[PDB]
Design a protein around this ligand. Sequence first.
Ligand SMILES: [Cu+2]
Ligand SMILES: [Cu+2]
Ligand SMILES: [Cu+2]
Ligand SMILES: [Cu+2]
Ligand SMILES: [Cu+2]
Ligand SMILES: [Cu+2]
Lengths: 333, 333, 333
Amino acid sequence: DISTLPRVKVDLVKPPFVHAHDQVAKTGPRVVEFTMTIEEKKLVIDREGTEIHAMTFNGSVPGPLMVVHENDYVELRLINPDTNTLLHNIDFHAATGALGGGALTQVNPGEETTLRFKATKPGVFVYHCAPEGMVPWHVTSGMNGAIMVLPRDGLKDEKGQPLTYDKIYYVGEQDFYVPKDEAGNYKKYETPGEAYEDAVKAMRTLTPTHIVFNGAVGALTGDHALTAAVGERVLVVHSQANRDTRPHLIGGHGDYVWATGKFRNPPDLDQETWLIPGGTAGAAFYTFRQPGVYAYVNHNLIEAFELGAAGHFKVTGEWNDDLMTSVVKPASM
Amino acid sequence: DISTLPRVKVDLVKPPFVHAHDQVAKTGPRVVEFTMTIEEKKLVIDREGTEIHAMTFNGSVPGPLMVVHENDYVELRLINPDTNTLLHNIDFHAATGALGGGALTQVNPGEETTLRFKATKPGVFVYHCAPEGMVPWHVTSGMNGAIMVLPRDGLKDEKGQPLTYDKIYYVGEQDFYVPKDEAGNYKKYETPGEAYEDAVKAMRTLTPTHIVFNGAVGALTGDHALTAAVGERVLVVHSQANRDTRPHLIGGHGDYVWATGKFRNPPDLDQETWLIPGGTAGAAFYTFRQPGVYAYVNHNLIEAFELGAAGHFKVTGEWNDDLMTSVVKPASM
Amino acid sequence: DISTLPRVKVDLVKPPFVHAHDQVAKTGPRVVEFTMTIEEKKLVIDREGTEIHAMTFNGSVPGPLMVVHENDYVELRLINPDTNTLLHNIDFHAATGALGGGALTQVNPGEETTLRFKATKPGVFVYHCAPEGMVPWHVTSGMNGAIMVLPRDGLKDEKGQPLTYDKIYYVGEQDFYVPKDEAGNYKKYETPGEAYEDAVKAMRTLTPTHIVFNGAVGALTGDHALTAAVGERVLVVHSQANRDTRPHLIGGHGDYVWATGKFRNPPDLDQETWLIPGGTAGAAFYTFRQPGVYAYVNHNLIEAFELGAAGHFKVTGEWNDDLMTSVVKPASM
Ligand SMILES: [Cu+2]
Ligand SMILES: [Cu+2]
Ligand SMILES: [Cu+2]
Ligand SMILES: [Cu+2]
Ligand SMILES: [Cu+2]
Ligand SMILES: [Cu+2]
């Protein structure tokens, strides 16, 4: 039955970007092949040169967003090159059975594997490494991402009408727990293994030292701000594989929001701030109505402005003074 | 267009009370004018006399609840008197553009401004100070409030039938991070600026020293308890501009709840406890059925009873044995 | 009126199991009678032998799951044997009035009391001891459980069509705050009251030392894992009386989820993870499609794998390769 299905090989794009795809499926079910190479590497996460041993899928934190349609088959080639030092695997929250695939994809350095599963449920899902015994260590090292399973007929609003986005961005929020010495200075290590014992102690406090988007403080600001123009409908996928988050677009709203990311449910309207539970991926749809700079933040202001969970959106267009304006006071009637 | 619109000035009331308004709009769009004066002042937040330098909108924590109807224009005159020492602004989650107004409202002591914005979406929203560089500090110091944008035809239940409340209260929950010395004794400072450096160090621990309703421990208890009578429909707007909370009425429920506070969505029924994400405002509707004392709390009981997030409701009326009765009063076995 | 209603005495069963009951009420409203004895006891909560003074309802943590139908009357006989040292009571989130019944059931050692209330709202609610002054201490010591008020016509899906479960399980998550000494060694006490002072201090940190399912780390693993078979519809009731949790079944999904547990509300579909607020009970409905081991965890992987909030499911049946299969098993590149 599956041999009569077309097979397509897709090349993944580094976040916050997403590979090309059709919102409304033009073909019947397919076997979408993806390839991801695991890379363990040192990553500088802040302005102060704090460095950590990131464990990544395709070299980025978060891993790339994969997009397929309901009932397509996802066939993933997971490679763990010999340059790495730890055993890894992959668990998709979209898959059914075998711990999300984690039980079937344990690969040591120098090993690879190919897993296939049917995307039977529409929605955006989290995928993350989960090695027996060191689950929270791999996840909080950035080894997580998301996969979007679009309904075959695209997104629909509260009333069943079509919702079409012109842009789509993937924002991966990551909570880090970097160990410090007695004074509070961040430690550096030679290999991931060396940091392990300290890492565990740091995680157990349940208090992140950093909370970033796209792997670093300010990763999504300045020359890297997300862009759009007045009139465009933007879909923002947001995942957090381990800790609760509450996204908010300062100066805008979430017109249609699937806080828990499951498309068979009607979206929530006009959200100012929405909660995305840890271990979940969510999606917000919004049409920009004013130009200018917008801050996309985790609305626990301390986490956004002190720990790092804040990004920018730079929107071009004409100002609408009917929506907002600085009043001039020369009158009484 | 605006020039030909009726204007109505409204005098704000200090929480938990709310200024006079109509649930169902008896007129067309209007320009509702409000005036708020910024006041930086010392505030005692607990029984032990702990004192902090509060930054308030109109002299209270939280600021007053502003109430308008969908499509009205809010016109706010913000005044920062010369007695204050810091620059402040305001960001409305209900507004579209210019960082919710923050980018258009920066005022130093001795300055004032008048912002106008269209209330395009119905629901309860948070509004807070957000000066570039010291956002968390201004919010955690109590500079936040909420605005309700009622649908022009009032509230509706799950089935589209009208919901009318007889009383409405506004509870703003506030998380405080008071700095401590080596022994654990709370610090005191002469001015807000003196406290800054320590304030940031305290915030970064992500652990509040106090979590209070209406500005202080027991602000809504004893002679300050919210009141009602068996049979009355009450609407409780609750806001938290920086941290998750989970309101609960011990002895009652949330008959119709808008946890994320956006009125175009149907409420959730018969909630025992609901989550209001930080940076959001929610609303619960309840009709009292039994007289007596009720405790309105944040259901992380440690936070409610140890940290201060607890309030009272003293309700009058006749007891109803059908709903509850002590068949056998406590007695020795 | 009540004097006429048929009465039914229920025999409680220890969690994670549930006592006999009908999903669909076969008779009209009745007075369902229950009896629970309070027991303070020492409990080993982890592999390392950490001991604590648990305060329980019926000798278990959590207390047993009580099931009744909408509009039945619940009559609970609560006994506090003279072997206990503290005063206790019970508050049902499902009841209306007297602080959920807490104000009418205060019993000292050597006392008992009988309370009757009407189950007017359908859903799974939390019940917990709540003595004036030591509320969080009693709750965080395991003195809590849940009660399910099913609709007289059983459960329904998003479209109103009947949902019938084959198995039902009750998972009570408990957050513990065990006091430690300088080195980090957990403390032991002779009696509950001796522990009180240290307890309060530990609680105020807001950081648990243990987060477990059913009373202990691994209580629902190995020979105690929950069981099911491919094709079976399972309903999992989950509660947390004081802190937020985010349930996730690794390798599965929540087909129908009532995150805040109130049945008059349609369920959310295809949830990967859902947030249940502290002081709330929720319910997830799933049908197993793959055999094998599934982990039921709190998706804050630190709280799950390091703190103890992880259970198992052992499912029997035939593997379905369409849903998922290993195309290439791990091997050297
Ligand atoms: Cu890994
Ligand atoms: Cu997971
Ligand atoms: Cu300010
Ligand atoms: Cu804000
Ligand atoms: Cu007790
Ligand atoms: Cu309670």
